[PDB]
């Protein structure tokens, strides 16, 4: 909004802003080293305690 | 263009509203050491030679 001027200094025009807002696309990445000799017993089925 | 005329009448016989300096929010100009250039503000006058 704007105040309508009372005097004849300048015409109290309307105001609208066209603003463009650029987004912040972030990438987060860790690692988790996991040993394959646990994967080998992951794939095997167990039968003994 | 929408005009809006408004009329204000004073229903009191004397003053009814008061202004006062409350707090200096800022001193805009500085109190520095300048000088009005008289060769700029009285530019027509000059010496003989």
Q: How would you label A16-39 residue by residue, b for 16+ Cβ within 10 Å and e otherwise?
A: eeeeeeeeeeeeeeeeeeeeeeee
DSSP string, A1-49: --PPPSSSSS-------------------------HHHHHHHHSPP---
């Amino acid at each position: 909004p704007t105040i309508a001027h009372g005097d004849g200094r300048r015409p109290s025009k309307q105001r609208t802003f066209i603003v463009v807002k650029n987004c912040h696309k972030h990438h987060i990445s860790t690692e988790m080293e996991l040993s394959m000799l646990d994967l080998e017993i992951l794939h095997s089925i167990p039968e003994t305690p | 263009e929408v005009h809006h005329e408004m009329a204000s009448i004073d229903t009191g016989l004397s003053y009814s509203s008061t202004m006062t300096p409350a707090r200096v929010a800022a001193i805009t100009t500085d109190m520095g050491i300048h000088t009005q250039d008289f060769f700029s503000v009285f530019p027509a006058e000059a010496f003989g030679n």
